[PDB]
Paper text:
Purified KpAcrB was then reconstituted into lipidic nanodiscs, and its structure was determined using single-particle cryo-electron microscopy (cryo-EM). The three-dimensional reconstitution of KpAcrB led to a cryo-EM map at a nominal resolution of 2.82 Å, enabling us to build a model of this pump. Among these residues, we obtained very good quality cryo-EM densities from the first 1,033 residues. Therefore, our final structural model includes residues 1 to 1,033 of KpAcrB. Interestingly, the cryo-EM structure of KpAcrB in the absence of drug indicates that this multidrug efflux pump forms an asymmetric trimer in which the three protomers possess distinct conformational states. Similar to structures of asymmetric EcAcrB, P. aeruginosa MexB, N. gonorrhoeae MtrD, and A. baumannii AdeJ, the conformations of the three apo-KpAcrB protomers can be assigned as “extrusion” (conformation of a protomer just after substrate export), “access” (presubstrate-binding form of a protomer with a vacant binding site), and “binding” (conformation of a protomer with a bound substrate) states, respectively (in a clockwise direction as shown Fig. 1B). No extra densities were observed within the periplasmic drug-binding sites of these three KpAcrB protomers, suggesting that our cryo-EM structure represents the apo form of KpAcrB (apo-KpAcrB). The entrance of the KpAcrB periplasmic cleft is surrounded with residues F663, F665, L667, R716, and L827. In KpAcrB, the composition of this distal hydrophobic patch is F178, V277, V611, and F614.
The [name] [name] (KpAcrB) multidrug efflux pump belongs to the resistance-nodulation-cell division (RND) superfamily of efflux transporters. This inner membrane efflux pump assembles with the KpAcrA periplasmic adaptor protein and the KpTolC outer membrane channel to form a tripartite efflux complex that spans the entire cell envelope to directly extrude drugs out of [name] cells. KpAcrB adopts the overall fold of hydrophobe-amphiphile efflux (HAE)-RND-type proteins and forms a homotrimer.
Numbering used by the authors:
A (entry chain A): 2 to 1033
B (entry chain C): 101 to 250
C (entry chain B): 51 to 150
D (entry chain C): 301 to 350
E (entry chain B): 850 to 899
The structure:
């Protein structure tokens, strides 16, 4: 620093380049709520229309799974196939895996495996996507009039909105909640039988009519010599409207009467799929969810989406209206604004505290122009590392506030008190102060580095979160140390004025009263320490008691991952029992919507109920509501917060007998589960079958019913078996008649499950052509006999002639794990117990299961098993490095123990604050605990360094030097503590948007600061004196 | 990784030109060393199971998880998985005036996993109360069922 | 055997509407010929790794491919690094006029 | 690393083998690698002692 | 041209426009960097300003 004391303008230009880099980074920094936390996952989705779970698993899922070989960095793969005919294979990769490479490898392997799939599955297509269930926003389209139904609105959205929205910068995956238009052909079995026609003939005619012919050219090469005209030939005409499809000729009768497609079917422009029905506040609607793109400002992308929708508003006909039933962007903006306000108020409070203690305007100006430089440089290095502006980074900067202001206050206060005691001019006082504290600052930087860097090396999603926090705080602390060695000494030399009119000459008024009172208190304090140093054995016993209490509190305190927040939106889910139709689920969802809009009219602003669609899986039983609350301003009080709303809804929804309806708040990160929860897979390792695996699961549940003191809330993650209709074809009877098995299967599938024949051009867009029965003729098992198949002799044969029927049980949804049949069990540990012992008990119970039934851990349980006991090892290494750095700083192997014994002093306060406020041991609590430890360690380091310098340079006794040290170091400790506590307190007492993370950050750090300062100021002299007496 | 991506991208242009049998067998693009990293053998100490039984166990229970292990370029099974082997007899085929084509067609028709739709699927009539999947025909599972094919 | 309008409606529009979200995409151009050929060219910002760009383009295209007509899928779709000028043109003539 | 992962996977598979079925290792080149590295490390330690 | 008919530059013209657009910022940043370097070296603001 002596270099920059005589070169203020060099320090100024260094600060200028730091601030310019910070501003440039802030301009070009992505902004999102959370960074990429979960391990990369790749989803393989295939649809087999009309297929059941067993058909999907035995023709699609197993074929794809057997060929998913040769992919790099694969942790596990899980798959399931449900009665909707959908196969979903999810492949999870290691945390460092490049998602693009993983996706391209999965896609290549699938493409090599595609020719092995059924033709229908290939025709539908298999989609390989990066799994990210994070709706940045969903934008719905409703109609005030009754003119446009679900299909019409969905088709308009698909044909006019999806492309412009996907063009907008920073957008990603889009899921339309409706379906695009299709040429639906509703066959009538009676009309088909009248004209001796089967669905096979209809399929053949439809395939023939729509075609494209490579007709050639008029003057194509090689041409005749002398040719003068060249023109392309267009031969085949594609059908475009419903009238042309109806005009398709199917058969010609003997008299010449022509059997068109109108005679046997009803043709209309309908939706591609009728499984998913979405309604917004009871009105027909269709929406599209948006996923955020990489390296994009979520706020900017949301603004771009809204601008695009606004520019498309005038084109919308009749009562078409854009509605936003779900958005997370306002919550992100509010939380980031609150963090920025916290930083600004922290700066203001540092100004106020420095003026209160020093009564020198320029001395207050010095740190006010030093912390912002550190924050800007932190933004710069953050952008350089590739990070973004998110909740974790911002709250890491908030936790770093104490460190930066501590460094600034330490430098300025030491300069000021050297200027006061010695009467030196500002420059000489600055040089002497920097001589006193310059090495200690470097040692502090090295020590604090060793306590935050080990966080970055934790594994998994929690490792990613800790890495965000660690890098942010390390960058901030290192830059603040750098600023305190470059800019701050120059500012002290130049800005500060010589102390005239005596020292602390202000005696009248509040500032004079404060000076007198603080001088008394400092004297009382020094006397107390003197008294404490007279008998240190009792206070060592007291410190032992404090440590034991710390261990007790740490053991007692429950653990968690992240706080649940009132994001302004929550999700409600309905699950109808067994084989319930779509109409019943729609009735249940309508009851839920009416409850939300009537009983919760104040809080709830809009509810976007979507039928047949679910986060877990599809089906006519499932139902999801995107219920969105009003602004946080409109909902004051805890009774109007999302938790109370959910509690009241669950109170109402528990009395709905027909369904099993739940309401819940958004998780902080979807991939992260409950910290007490475990994800357990029950694998069929010996080809036992579905029934034996189900029996093993039931036996395991019976065992888990015992030992309720460890496991609570265990449940399947799948669906129980449901009755299924078995159509058994007699081969002998089928061959006895002229009917063929291909004809029978084609008729049955195209009638009851539908067929996708071919495409057609609609208004310049390619749309599908589907055939299926009219709903009237495929609703009941009696309707099977309404369908006929033509024999070879030309006679129609009823299905009852060559087939029989029965009702049997089958699985509506089968699942596999790592290529073997599996059942996913998820539950929670008991409140007293921990996740590890719950998992151990589950492992023992699974071991008690019959032979051939394995088990495995997935989800967060897999990472917990993979990375266990790593934190103790990393923190042991951190302690070793801290001891070595302190030994280097103090040139002793024994003195470092005096500093290192202050950790429990802050941990006890953090734990007490968490306990009294009823909080948990979450990520914010732990990072705040580390920041508290760092600050207490810095205070102890400075006290011990000053005492040692007094003993050596001044040749004072042990007790005399210790007393003079603590006297000198009291003001800075109180100043920094008061500033940090006042800055933190709004986080503790906040109750608005994002107050969960704010409270988690604030309470622990406030309690830790209070007890750390109060206890340390008396225990670090004791530690120093005891250590010095014991050794030499 | 990039080399494999480019090689497979070039391959995708030639795959439709290949015979349907070759595609049905499945093509493998791999990035593996020529030499064997290790050989893992499986031995039945009872002496009951013979090579074919052991090989099927290995193919059905060990080959795929090893193939999915990260860093495994290629796995060669020193044997073969079990398959439904139909051993045709020309004399018996001639007696009943049957060719292998008839056997192929019969296997395609009577060993199939049929997607028969749902009983009550969407769009439903107003007032529908039941929705159940229809099971029509599953792939045969043992030798008796294959031998019973008409 | 498709006209330019058919190509635009059936293949180019689908492929280009799926080409969204690719990193560092500077601009995109497309054309459809009466010969039945569709060409989509993605130009990226200078300095972008062409291999990662090709990987991402392949990832997006695989989603659009099932939506394309079956004939164009049978023909095959090529994703290649694109240049607009010839480095060289090596020509081969036959003296003696023996060969056409 | 690949050999260690393979051995871990086989260890997971082993408790489900039917009766007499046993895994043998007729050919493996990684033991030579690790034993050679260990020999060189012992050479270094002996060099320090000498 | 009539309304609804836009335009855009591509190829070499895109790069030419980009160059012309980013030229003033380049001069400003270079001048600022030189000024700061001179201020650091000569320990004055008046010397770089002159």
């Amino acid at each position: 620093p002596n270099f920059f004391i005589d070169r203020p303008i060099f320090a100024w230009v260094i600060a200028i380049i730091i601030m310019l880099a910070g501003g440039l980074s802030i301009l070009k920094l992505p902004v999102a709520q959370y960074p990429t936390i979960a391990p990369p996952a790749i989803s393989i989705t295939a649809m087999y229309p009309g297929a059941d779970a067993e058909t999907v698993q035995n023709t699609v899922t197993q074929v794809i799974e057997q060929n998913m070989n040769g992919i790099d960095h694969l942790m596990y793969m899980s798959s399931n196939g449900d009665s909707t005919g959908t196969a979903t294979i999810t492949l999870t990769f290691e945390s460092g895996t490049d998602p693009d490479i993983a996706q391209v490898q999965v896609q290549n392997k699938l493409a090599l495996a595609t020719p092995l799939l059924p033709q229908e599955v290939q025709q539908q297509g298999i989609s390989v996507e990066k799994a990210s269930s994070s709706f940045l926003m969903v934008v719905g389209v409703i109609n005030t009039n009754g003119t446009m139904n679900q299909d019409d609105i969905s088709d308009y959205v698909a044909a006019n909105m999806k492309d412009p929205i996907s063009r907008t910068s920073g957008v990603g995956d889009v899921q339309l909640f409706g379906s695009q238009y299709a040429m639906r052909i509703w066959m009538d079995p009676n009309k088909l039988n009248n004209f001796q026609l089967t669905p096979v003939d209809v399929i053949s005619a439809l395939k023939a009519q729509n075609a494209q012919v490579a007709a050639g050219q008029l003057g194509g090469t090689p041409p005749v010599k002398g040719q003068q005209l060249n023109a392309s030939i267009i031969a085949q005409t594609r059908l475009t409207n419903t009238e042309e499809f109806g005009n398709i000729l199917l058969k010609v009768n003997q008299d010449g009467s022509q059997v068109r497609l109108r005679d046997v079917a009803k043709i209309e422009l309908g939706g591609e799929s009728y499984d998913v029905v979405a309604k917004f506040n009871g009105q027909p609607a269709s929406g599209l969810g948006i996923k955020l793109a990489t390296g994009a400002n979520a706020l900017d992308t949301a603004n771009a989406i809204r601008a695009e929708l606004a520019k498309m508003e005038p084109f919308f006909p009749s009562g078409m209206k854009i509605v936003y039933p779900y958005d997370t962007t306002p919550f992100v903006k509010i939380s980031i604004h609150e963090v920025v306000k916290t930083l600004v108020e922290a700066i203001i409070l540092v100004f106020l505290v420095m003026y209160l203690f020093l009564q020198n305007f320029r001395a207050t100006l010095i740190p006010t122009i030093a912390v912002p430089v550190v924050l800007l440089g932190t933004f710069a290095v953050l952008a350089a590392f590739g990070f973004s502006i998110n909740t974790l980074t911002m709250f890491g900067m908030v936790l770093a506030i104490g460190l930066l202001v501590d460094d600034a206050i330490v430098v300025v206060e030491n300069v000021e008190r050297v200027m006061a005691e010695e009467g030196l001019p500002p420059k000489e006082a600055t040089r002497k102060s920097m001589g006193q504290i310059q090495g200690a600052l470097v040692g502090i930087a090295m020590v604090l580095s060793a306590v935050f860097i080990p966080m970055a090396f934790f594994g998994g999603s929690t490792g990613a979160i800790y890495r965000q926090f660690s890098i942010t705080i390390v960058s901030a602390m290192a830059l603040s140390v750098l600023v305190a060695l470059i800019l701050t000494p120059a500012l002290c030399a130049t800005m500060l004025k010589p102390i005239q009119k005596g020292s602390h000459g202000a005696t009248t008024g509040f500032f004079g009263w404060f000076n007198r009172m603080f001088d008394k208190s400092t004297h009382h304090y020094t006397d107390s320490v003197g008294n404490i140093l007279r008998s240190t054995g009792r206070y060592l016993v007291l410190y032992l008691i404090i440590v034991v209490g710390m261990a007790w509190l740490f053991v007692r305190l429950p653990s968690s991952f992240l706080p649940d927040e009132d994001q302004g939106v929550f999700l409600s889910m309905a699950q109808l029992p067994a084989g319930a139709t779509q109409e019943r689920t729609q009735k249940v969802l309508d009851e839920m919507t009416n409850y939300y809009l009537t009983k919760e009219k104040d809080n709830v602003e809009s509810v976007f109920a979507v039928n047949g669609f679910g986060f877990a899986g599809r089906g006519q039983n499932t139902g999801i509501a995107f219920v969105s609350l009003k602004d946080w301003s409109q909902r004051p009080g805890e009774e109007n917060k999302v938790e109370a709303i959910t509690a009241r809804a669950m109170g109402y929804f528990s009395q709905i007998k027909d369904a099993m309806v739940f309401a819940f708040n958004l998780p902080a990160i979807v991939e992260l589960g409950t910290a007490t929860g475990f994800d357990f897979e029950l694998i069929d390792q010996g080809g036992l079958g579905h029934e034996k695996l189900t029996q093993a699961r039931n036996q395991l549940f019976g065992m888990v019913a015992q030992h309720p003191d460890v496991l609570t809330g265990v449940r399947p993650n799948g669906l129980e078996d449901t009755p299924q209709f078995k159509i058994d074809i007699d081969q002998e009877k089928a061959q006895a008649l002229g009917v063929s098995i291909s004809d029978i299967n084609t008729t049955l599938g195209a009638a009851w499950g539908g067929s996708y024949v071919n495409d057609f051009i609609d208004r310049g867009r390619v749309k599908k052509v589907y055939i299926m029965s009219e709903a009237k003729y495929r609703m009941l098992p009696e309707d099977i006999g309404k369908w006929y198949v033509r024999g070879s002799d030309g006679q129609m044969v009823p299905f009852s002639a060559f087939s029989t029927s029965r009702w049997e049980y089958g699985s509506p949804r089968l699942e596999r794990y790592n290529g073997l049949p599996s059942l996913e069990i998820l539950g929670q540990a008991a409140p007293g117990k921990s996740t590890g012992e719950a998992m151990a008990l589950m492992e023992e119970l699974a071991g008690k299961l019959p032979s051939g039934i394995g088990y495995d851990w997935t989800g967060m349980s897999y990472q917990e098993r993979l990375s266990g006991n790593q934190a103790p090892a990393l923190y042991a290494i951190s302690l070793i490095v801290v001891f070595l750095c302190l030994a280097a700083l103090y040139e002793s192997w024994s003195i470092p123990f005096s500093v290192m014994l202050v950790v429990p002093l802050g941990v006890v306060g953090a734990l007490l604050a968490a306990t009294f406020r009823g909080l948990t041991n979450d990520v914010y609590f732990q990072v705040g605990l580390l920041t508290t430890i760092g600050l207490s360690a810095k205070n102890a380091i400075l006290i011990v360094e000053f005492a040692k310098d007094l003993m050596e340079k001044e040749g004072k006794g042990l007790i005399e030097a210790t007393l003079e040290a603590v006297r000198m170091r009291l003001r800075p400790i109180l100043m920094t503590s008061l500033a940090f506590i006042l800055g933190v307190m709004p986080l503790v007492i906040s109750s608005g948007a994002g107050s969960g993370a704010q409270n988690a950050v604030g309470t622990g750090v406030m309690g830790g600061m209070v007890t750390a300062t109060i206890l340390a100021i008396f225990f670090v002299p004791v530690f120093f004196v005891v250590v010095r007496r014991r050794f030499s």
